[PDB]
Structure 1
């Protein structure tokens, strides 16, 4: 309830700022003013063409490591259990496997960008 009211207040304030921005000042638009900016010269192609991503493997590894951090997050509560030895073994197991994944990718050159 309170969080919803806060979110509504913030979004309303931002929208009001946009509305004031687009209606208060004097407007004068023509084709040259609204054309895309490429440092004074017309763009040769289009900005919607494919843009090669030289770190494509690191993004997938980031997805997997995001899973790893999601698994690791409930650790502060897991340390309140009586099975401390088992919990410690499992936490260290997960972190060692994550380290092994990082080392394997590093040695197999998955962290290097495409040329």
Structure 2
């Protein structure tokens, strides 16, 4: 219940400031004023997604070090990170990480 109140208070407070911000100066009456897809940007987002997913597989590492099979665990932990570095090398050499046309 505590975490629920904390979220309710923060967003309720933010909404109040926003609406009274759009209305408090409107208590004033000012005269009415009257009167390309980029490919490289997309590749940054996709590269982040595939890297972000691989991070999801690495988050449980601290708990994985508590096992009695450290030899197996340490072998796969270094395999995931090595594979993550192989993806970076492939993009680097294939001109993926460039911003020049």
Q: TM-score, normalised by structure 1?
A: 0.76
Q: What's the RMSD between the two structures over aligned residues?
A: 1.6
Structure 1 position 114, deviation (Å): 5.3
The reply on whether 1:113 has 2:99 as its aligned counterpart is yes
Structure 1 position 90, deviation (Å): 0.2
* Residue of structure 1 in register with 2:22 after alignment: 22
Q: How many corresponding residue pairs?
A: 98
CA contact (8 A) 1:54 1:114 kept: no
Structure 1 position 60, deviation (Å): 1.1
* Residue of structure 2 in register with 1:84 after alignment: 70
Rounded Cα–Cα distance in structure 1 between residues aligned with 2:29 and 2:12: 24
The reply on whether 1:7 has 2:7 as its aligned counterpart is yes
Question: Structure 1 pair 27/93, CA: closer, same or farther in 2 (3 Å)?
Answer: farther
Whichever structure has more helix as a proportion of its residues is: 2
Unaligned runs of 5+ in 1: 33-49
Rounded Cα–Cα distance in structure 1 between residues aligned with 2:6 and 2:68: 40
Q: TM-score, normalised by structure 2?
A: 0.86
* Residue of structure 2 in register with 1:74 after alignment: 60
